[PDB]
Design a protein around this ligand. Structure first.
Ligand code: HO
Ligand code: HO
Ligand code: HO
Lengths: 149, 149, 149
C-alpha cells in the first residue's frame, strides 16, 4: 500500500511528462518550426536591444541570428519589419561578434561590415528587404527570438 | 664582495628554480600525466559546480572537459563516480558551450544534446559508464580538474 | 522656404560627412595603414595592461594582436620597444586566449606556450626581436592599438 501509491504517482508523473512533451512539439510545429531546423518567433513588439536579449533569455532561446541565406529569409518573413539580430560590435568596432560569441560566418550588409568611426551604432537590424545595417542598440526594433533545431 | 654575493644568491635562486621544476614534473608523472597530454586530477570531493570552478581556478587548471574518446575515458577512470564537466548551457538552452568558450566539438550524451525545456538543468556530469547527462549546477558532484599537455 | 532650409542643411550635413570620411582615410594612410589591412598605432606610452585595454577601447580599436608573421613584424616596427599584445592566460593557465576570445592561431614564443606554474605572469609582451614572453599584467609596457582592415 505504501509503495503502491508511490508507483501510481510516479507513473502518473510520467504521463504528465509525456503530455507536456507533445504540447511542446505541437506548439513548435504551429510556430512554424521546420523539421530538424532552428525556428524563429516574435510577439511583434519593438524594444531596445537590451530588452530583446532579456526577453529571449527568459524564454530560454536567444536573439535571432541568421547563419545562412535560408535563415536570413526565415527571420525576415517572421519579423515583417526591422528587427534586431543577435550580433554586435560593442566590444571591437567594425568587428561584429555573435552575442553568444565568435566572428561572423555569414552576413548580408547593405555594403561592407560597418565601422561607425565613433558614432556608436553597435547593434544590427535586418530590414524588410533582408539587408543588414548597424544601428543604435538604444533604438527600439522588433524582438525576434530563435530556438534550437 | 658586493657583486660576489649577488652572484652567489642569483645562482642560488636558479638552483631552487631547477629543483621546483623537477618537483612539478615528478608530481605530474605521479598524478598520471601521459607524455605530451593533458591530465586530470581529483580530490574525490563532491560539490556544486560553482565550487568546482573556483577550486580548479585556484589550482590554475580548469574543470575537466573531454574533447575525444580517449579523454572521456581518462576522466571517467579518475572520477570513478559522477563528475561535473567544464560545459554548460546556462546561456543558450540546448546549446552547450565550454566554460572557456565555444560550441562542443565532441560529446557523449545519453541521447542527443539535451534541451530541458525550462527545468533548468544547465550543467553536465559524466557517469560511471562514460555517458553525459544534463543536471542541476546546484547538485553536488565530483570535482575533477584538468591541466595542459 | 520651410523645406528649403531643411534641404540645404541636410545637404550641408552630407558635405561634412564626406569631408570627415576623407580626413579619416588620410589619417589612416599617414598612420601607415596598408591597403586592405589592419594597422597598428602607438603613443609610445608605457602602462599596465588594464590601462592599455581601456585606452584602445576608448579609441574604438583593441590591443594589438599579431595573427601572422607579417603583423608580428608590423607591430614590432611600430612599438620599437616591449609592448603588450591582446592575449592573456588569466583564465586558464598555459592556454592563452585573445582578449576578444579564442585560442591562438599564431604565436612566436621564446620557447613554448608558457605555463608559469603559479607565479601569475598572465599577459604577453612582444620584445625588440619579435619574440613573445609571458609577463605580469601589472608591469608597464608600451600601448599599441590595432584598427580593422
Ligand atoms: Ho559600431
Ligand atoms: Ho539546460
Ligand atoms: Ho600565466
Amino acid at each position: 500500500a505504501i509503495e503502491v501509491k508511490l508507483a501510481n504517482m510516479e507513473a502518473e508523473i510520467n504521463t504528465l511528462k509525456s503530455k507536456l512533451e507533445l504540447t511542446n512539439k505541437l506548439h513548435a510545429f504551429s510556430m512554424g518550426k521546420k523539421s530538424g531546423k532552428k525556428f524563429f518567433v516574435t510577439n511583434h513588439e519593438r524594444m531596445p536591444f537590451s530588452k530583446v536579449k532579456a526577453l529571449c533569455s527568459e524564454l530560454r532561446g536567444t536573439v535571432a541570428i541568421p547563419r545562412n541565406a535560408e535563415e536570413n529569409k526565415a527571420i525576415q518573413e517572421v519579423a515583417k519589419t526591422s528587427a534586431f539580430l543577435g550580433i554586435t560590435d560593442e566590444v571591437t568596432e567594425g568587428q561584429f561578434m555573435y552575442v553568444t560569441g565568435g566572428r561572423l560566418t555569414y552576413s548580408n550588409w547593405k555594403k561592407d561590415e560597418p565601422n561607425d568611426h565613433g558614432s556608436g551604432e553597435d547593434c544590427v537590424t535586418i530590414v524588410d528587404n533582408g539587408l543588414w545595417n548597424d544601428i543604435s542598440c538604444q533604438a527600439s526594433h522588433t524582438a525576434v527570438c530563435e530556438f534550437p533545431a
